[PDB]
Amino acid sequence: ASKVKQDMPPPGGYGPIDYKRNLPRRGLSGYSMFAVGIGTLLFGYWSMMKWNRERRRLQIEDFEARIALMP
């Protein structure tokens, strides 16, 4: 003869439940990304310039060794 016991919601109420779309912005601006890309390209160009000039000098040296040995 005890009290009625049934599955029921708790005293007061259940906590609020989220349902709305949540997609944060989470990114840099286009200007920053373009600037970083162009800077990387320029740095690579200058490094390649130095290395290619050094390689040209090395090729000239090897060709001169061949010229010395040819006769």
């Binding site: 000098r57 000239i60 060709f63 040819m70």
Partner: protein
Amino acid sequence: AGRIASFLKNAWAKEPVLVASFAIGGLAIILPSLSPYTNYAIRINRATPYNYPVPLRDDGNMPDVPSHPQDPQGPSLEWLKNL
């Protein structure tokens, strides 16, 4: 000058790929004529000794031709070591 700016903005808003392609192509077309190192590249190409240099017969009237590779006469590559 006012309609073309709007055209540029519309192209950037609709076809960025084509804008980038045309800009890159135009830069590649016009920059090499304004660069001081183009002649440097030509000189580097001309300085690569692919074949043997056949010596010239001494007729006694060529002060400008060296009689030995280490003589002061002849061309110089000192400009290349500083590059």
